[PDB]
Amino acid sequence: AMSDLELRQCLPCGPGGKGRCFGPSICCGDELGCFVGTAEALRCQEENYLPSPCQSGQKPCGSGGRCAAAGICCNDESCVTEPEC
Amino acid sequence: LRQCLPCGPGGKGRCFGPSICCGDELGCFVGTAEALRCQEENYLPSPCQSGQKPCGSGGRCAAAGICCNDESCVTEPEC
Numbered sequence: 001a002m003s004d005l006e007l008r009q010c011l012p013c014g015p016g017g018k019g020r021c022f023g024p025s026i027c028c029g030d031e032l033g034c035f036v037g038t039a040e041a042l043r044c045q046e047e048n049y050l051p052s053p054c055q056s057g058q059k060p061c062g063s064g065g066r067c068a069a070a071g072i073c074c075n076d077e078s079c080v081t082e083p084e085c
Numbered sequence: 086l087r088q089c090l091p092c093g094p095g096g097k098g099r100c101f102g103p104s105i106c107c108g109d110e111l112g113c114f115v116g117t118a119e120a121l122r123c124q125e126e127n128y129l130p131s132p133c134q135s136g137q138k139p140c141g142s143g144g145r146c147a148a149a150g151i152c153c154n155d156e157s158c159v160t161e162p163e164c
Binding site (some may be wrong): 023025038069080 | 115117120156
């Protein structure tokens with residue numbers, strides 16, 4: 001909307017759609033963990049069809065990532081262990 | 086250096102780090118229930134290193150398209 005402060009999360013994914021897509025093949029969720037290239041993350045490929053900017057997660061960390069699950073920090077092509085998260 | 090503990094669905098994963106469990110089969114689990122066994126490698130006196138084809142920051146190809154070390158996985162396509 002006004003700013004990127006109002007940016008939407010990406011498609012949901014994983015078990016019960018309890019995760020959110022952090023990249024085309026990362027599906028994370030605070031109660032879920034992160035799936036990197038697994039089947040649960042497959043749905044995240046669908047986001048590249050949407051004509052609209054998304055960004056999952058709230059708290060920045062690592063190299064342009066946001067705290068994707070407990071202890072993990074994901075951008076759209078990596079997930080590092082990161083205690084900040 | 087022996088490969089690290091097996092982990093994940095039907096033993097077809099290797100532990101790459103205390104919370105990472107990858108299989109060329111399954112992909113990678115980072116901090117999921119699948120990757121919980123990888124903790125247990127802290128209890129074994131022998132050093133390990135799963136995977137074999139080297140990539141990125143001191144890591145090995147973990148799954149199709151994925152390079153992991155003991156604390157990170159990165160979409161990395163030489164793998």
